[PDB]
Amino acid sequence: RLLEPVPFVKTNNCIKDVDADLFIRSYATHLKLHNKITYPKWCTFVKTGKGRKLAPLNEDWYFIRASSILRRLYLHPDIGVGFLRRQFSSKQRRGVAPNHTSLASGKILRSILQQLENLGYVEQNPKKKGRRLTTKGENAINNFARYINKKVYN
């Protein structure tokens, strides 16, 4: 599907050398297999952000979100909740008044982050700013990426 004749070699080492959506999906699947992260209470009847005016329709969207968050963390040095919210923003059609940008429902994100920290994937750094990845977690992510790459090659 993705593969093609390219004019260079790809150092498939870290997650930045992997296609995103597929990777996310894979991570979600892995999570599901594990049963490493829960699905709180309110998750199953909440709306992800003001602009969505409708539920997710993905069943295991939470897992996907978590995966995305991990990737984001890997990408940036130190990333807050506000930043995360901003990242997962969309257009809110206000019916008749024109669209505005809409900040995501941060609570769910926060919960996810908390869960991750409990599990030992993210790390609230006392120096600098809000919650980056923890080294072990990063390593795990890298491994997963590598695995994905291998699969794709196969």
Binding site: F8, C14, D17
Partner: protein, 138 residues
């Protein structure tokens, strides 16, 4: 050894650091495998295809992009690559080869070497856009 040039489309400066290496070619921290949309991918790969994939096994490339939207960014990247490879050739490889490469690029199209000079013209009062005025009913 190592050569730094830029591309430029709209605002969107892609700075291509072209170094001695094995032939990987990257964007900020990501392979050119990604870029973003599958459709536009060819606009980045095209100079490489023109020059040949074997010629770039001596040359590593990193590209830092900043500013602009998507298509513009891609264009900038392309431009950087075009300027970059040629610049490298002019210095550390021969002149004849460089000339050949330039000729090839010219035959394909402009924009690879020379830049797109267009930029967003200031909006003017009495309207929303540059030229587009409002509306009179009489």
């Amino acid at each position: 050894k190592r050569v730094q040039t830029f591309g430029k489309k709209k605002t969107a400066v892609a700075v291509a650091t072209v170094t001695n290496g094995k032939g990987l070619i990257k964007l900020n921290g990501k392979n050119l495998d990604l870029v973003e949309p599958y459709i536009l991918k060819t606009k980045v790969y095209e100079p490489l295809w023109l020059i040949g994939s074997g010629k770039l096994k001596n040359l590593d490339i990193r590209i830092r992009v900043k500013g602009g939207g998507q298509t513009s960014q891609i264009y900038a990247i392309r431009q950087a690559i075009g300027k970059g490879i040629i610049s490298y050739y002019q210095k550390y490889v021969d002149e004849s080869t460089k000339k050949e490469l330039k000729d090839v690029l010219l035959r394909y199209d402009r924009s690879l070497l020379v830049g797109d000079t267009r930029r967003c013209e200031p909006k003017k009062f009495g309207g929303k856009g540059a030229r587009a005025r409002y509306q009179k009913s009489y």
